UniProtKB/TrEMBL annotation, chain B:
<comment type="subunit">
    <text>Component of the 19S proteasome regulatory particle complex. The 26S proteasome consists of a 20S core particle (CP) and two 19S regulatory subunits (RP). The regulatory particle is made of a lid composed of 9 subunits including PSMD3, a base containing 6 ATPases and few additional components. Interacts with UBQLN1 (via ubiquitin-like domain). Interacts with ERCC6.</text>
</comment>
<feature type="domain" description="PCI">
    <location>
        <begin position="17"/>
        <end position="196"/>
    </location>
</feature>
<comment type="function">
    <text>Component of the 26S proteasome, a multiprotein complex involved in the ATP-dependent degradation of ubiquitinated proteins. This complex plays a key role in the maintenance of protein homeostasis by removing misfolded or damaged proteins, which could impair cellular functions, and by removing proteins whose functions are no longer required. Therefore, the proteasome participates in numerous cellular processes, including cell cycle progression, apoptosis, or DNA damage repair.</text>
</comment>
<protein>
    <recommendedName>
        <fullName>26S proteasome non-ATPase regulatory subunit 3</fullName>
    </recommendedName>
</protein>
<comment type="similarity">
    <text>Belongs to the proteasome subunit S3 family.</text>
</comment>
From TrEMBL, chain C:
<keyword id="KW-0378">Hydrolase</keyword>
<dbReference type="GO" id="GO:0061133">
    <property type="term" value="F:endopeptidase activator activity"/>
</dbReference>
<protein>
    <submittedName>
        <fullName>Proteasome (Prosome, macropain) 26S subunit, non-ATPase, 14</fullName>
    </submittedName>
</protein>
<dbReference type="GO" id="GO:0070628">
    <property type="term" value="F:proteasome binding"/>
</dbReference>
<dbReference type="GO" id="GO:0046872">
    <property type="term" value="F:metal ion binding"/>
</dbReference>
UniProtKB/TrEMBL annotation, chain F:
<protein>
    <recommendedName>
        <fullName>26S proteasome complex subunit SEM1</fullName>
    </recommendedName>
</protein>
<comment type="function">
    <text>Component of the 26S proteasome, a multiprotein complex involved in the ATP-dependent degradation of ubiquitinated proteins.</text>
</comment>
<comment type="similarity">
    <text>Belongs to the DSS1/SEM1 family.</text>
</comment>
UniProtKB/TrEMBL annotation, chain G:
<feature type="domain" description="MPN">
    <location>
        <begin position="9"/>
        <end position="144"/>
    </location>
</feature>
<dbReference type="InterPro" id="IPR000555">
    <property type="entry name" value="JAMM/MPN+_dom"/>
</dbReference>
<keyword id="KW-0647">Proteasome</keyword>
<dbReference type="InterPro" id="IPR037518">
    <property type="entry name" value="MPN"/>
</dbReference>
<dbReference type="GO" id="GO:0008237">
    <property type="term" value="F:metallopeptidase activity"/>
</dbReference>
Amino acid sequence: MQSGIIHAAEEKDWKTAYSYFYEAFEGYDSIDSPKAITSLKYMLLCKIMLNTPEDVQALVSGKLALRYAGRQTEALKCVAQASKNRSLADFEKALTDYRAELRDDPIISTHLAKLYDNLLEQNLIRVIEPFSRVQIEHISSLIKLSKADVERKLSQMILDKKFHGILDQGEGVLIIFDEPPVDKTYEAALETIQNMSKVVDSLYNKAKKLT
Amino acid sequence: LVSKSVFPEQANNNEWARYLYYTGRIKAIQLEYSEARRTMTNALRKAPQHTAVGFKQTVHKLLIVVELLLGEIPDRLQFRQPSLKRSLMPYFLLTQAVRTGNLAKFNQVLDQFGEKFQTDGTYTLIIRLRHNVIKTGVRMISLSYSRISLADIAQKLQLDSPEDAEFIVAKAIRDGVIEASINHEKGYVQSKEMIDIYSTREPQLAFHQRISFCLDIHNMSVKAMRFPPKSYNKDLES
Amino acid sequence: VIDAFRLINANMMVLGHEPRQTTSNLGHLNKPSIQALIHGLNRHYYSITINYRKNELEQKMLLNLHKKSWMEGLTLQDYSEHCKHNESVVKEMLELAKNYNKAVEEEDKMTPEQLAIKNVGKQDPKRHLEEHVDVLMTSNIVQCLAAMLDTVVFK
Amino acid sequence: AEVKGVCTEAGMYALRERRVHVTQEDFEMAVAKVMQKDSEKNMSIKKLWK
Amino acid sequence: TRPANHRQLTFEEIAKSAKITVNKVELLVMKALSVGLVRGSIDEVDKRVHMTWVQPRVLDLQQIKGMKDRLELWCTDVKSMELLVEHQAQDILT
Amino acid sequence: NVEDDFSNQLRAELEKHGYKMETS
Amino acid sequence: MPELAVQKVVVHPLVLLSVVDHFNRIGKVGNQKRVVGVLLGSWQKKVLDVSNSFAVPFDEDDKDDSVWFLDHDYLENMYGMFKKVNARERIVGWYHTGPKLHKNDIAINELMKRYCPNSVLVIIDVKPKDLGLPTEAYISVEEVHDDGTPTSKTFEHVTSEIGAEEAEEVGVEHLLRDIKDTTVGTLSQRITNQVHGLKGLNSKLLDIRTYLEKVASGKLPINHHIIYQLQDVFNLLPDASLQEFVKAFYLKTNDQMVVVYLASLIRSVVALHNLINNKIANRDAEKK
């Protein structure tokens, strides 16, 4: 349980940290330590960081995991749900009331920054999916976050090729391309053809003997 | 003489190389660069002979001026490999001049060097090499941008007049190698072309040329494999 | 594998009478199953000649397969399918390619057992890569050729 | 056998930490884990293997 | 009449003949695509109707004459093409 | 092709400084 | 009685063979007349594999429909007899000897249902023709007509294929002066298939075409099916489009060539020397 705190927070190996908290959690229930309550809270913190909000929600049940549940588990369950729906706005309002609980743990604090950025990216692709030649301002309203931050994020996404587009800063519009015509037939063909050029070089060397 | 000739198809490999080189210089004069380059290259591999040593320098020297005219601009690497780089050396300058596409550099270099060039059989061609340099400049101006002012182009290539740029651009479009429009009144060249090879009927053409070179290679590999066994079969072995 | 017997006694074979009776025969001998069968055959009357009464009308009936060849020669599949085939083959060809380099560099050996271990001669990259180029080429030609033929003709 | 046991124990630690390279940390825990095996060998006045 | 030879037709003529408004003619026409009485689309970006397929009204004498002359042209086409396919790859065909 | 490297290093540093003053 | 229990029909080489023979065997009764036989085979199988056929006497008029003779006795004696040898093989039905499907057929079929547990109409187009198959399969379907009287008996086509046991295939090769014809195989066969397809398509279009002329003038009925089919051709408007090529073939033969040459080099010494030995070899052989 102590190992997770260090692992998660600084190194950013959320998997490794999670596996450690789960080892404590198992051990703890058998005696029924209060420490068990704490451990369950951490597991949820680590998966939300990965941004699989689904698992965070599913694992907390009204069953067994209600006896290791707390206040933290309830703040964690809502922010995840908000992240799953792809609205930034809900997560942000929710986060204000909970902030006191978040601050005590260093693991969440660091994890929130990245999770915030992730929320913007997923929210963005959703806005971008049906649209084409959409105003940036329209996008800024849907995300409900500041215009500049949006322009910047939008650019990163183009680079990564998340939806692939071009952002026109000269007109206040974002150009969206959609549903690639890129085919696997072509892509597979590229790997093979590079290996062929190698074989011919080796063949020519042997050729010299024959001549 | 050529029109009345018939080369046997069962002539030997030295005989073919000599014939091909010599034929190659002739079609190049007529305005047929495409067959001229291929005939000269193949002669060198076909017969490595001690006769062949005297010929090789001429074949490469003539070959380079012959390529520039067809519409390919040869790369640097080719100069480096046959270790005859020095023989090739005055030629190498003429090449760097086409890739830049600037007219002014070409005329000076080609003149001083021109005296040497007379020797290979290049002199007749030499004049026509002038036009390739600009043709390469026009292809870059149209392709790269949409609209750039006519005056900017005039300065870059070093043409005599901004007026001179119009007339040359106007001819080039008719040939249809450029695929642009020049707007005389508006003061710019408009790029009508876009870079593609999947759009029109054209990916099929792209396959056609790739496949075409192959059909010849296939026929040669297969026939050649069989060829020692043909003599063994005649020698009476199964 | 068919044989004919009239079947006559053992003594007739032993004496050598049995070839006097058979005249107007050619005869033949085959062995489905060892010495025991040969002995059984000799005792009987051995293989007496079987001829066939056959002709071209009967021969034509047996020839057949499908008139349905009529629909099938023209038929070509969905374009997504054309792509599946092309992809599967190019992907396959990559795997074998790495062995191929060795193959061309070497293969001085001509002894099938030694070659097999040395340059992965058994599971050869040459045989299979050729086999692969040939399926892909033919498959693409018939599908492509049909699509175009149908277009012109129906309209 | 004990000395090799250090490298071998190290690998278990690298998986656990989820590393790809066996770090210094893996080795720290390994010496101490191997020292406990040694202690057992000595207690029993017979070899461990059977 | 017009669909068959060339696919598209204007939607403006059909609304005026109806003598009923544009916002209610579309409604019946959509219903017709749905059942399968007719197949195709209504494109309001140009206010035209693109018909993919049309039903042939049944037991009309005139239609039989119409299909016959077309059919003969197709028959020619098959024969013309067949000579070409055999010409190249004849060695391979045997 | 042509030797772009010799020319770009000298041009890029120098031209850029004048361009700073000239334009944004 | 069962005719609806067959989706697919497969025939052995035997049945196609057997029918031609029966035609003569009856005492050469033909012309206008036909010859029928029993088909013996399977049923209660979605696939119909007709095992054998044996000859039956028959006189047919197909220009009338109020006279035909069908031998009653043969069907019954043959069904009763066969159970002991094969309990699955029962009388599957009867073959008609061309040239095409008739309405004249429903009548003959009816009797066959009564006698025989099963019937099926396999139409073998006349005396030996064609490179491919000449058999079509039909099952008698009962339908309503919304203009006449419900319960009419007519024939609907079902897919015809072939198929036979291992021993039989082996027999065909022995007898025959080749093995089989085209349907798809080698590189050559696929191209033949294409040419086979064009002559075949052309035949189908003539049937429709000759019919329209006959319906328009000469007053053959107007059916919704014929008209539906024709209209679609115009509507679909297929548009020629890109793709399907490859260039790989050359590299493979080139790769094989280098190895092939190493083999010819070792071969050369023996092959070259052998030439002299052969001429001398012939003299020695003759001497001793």
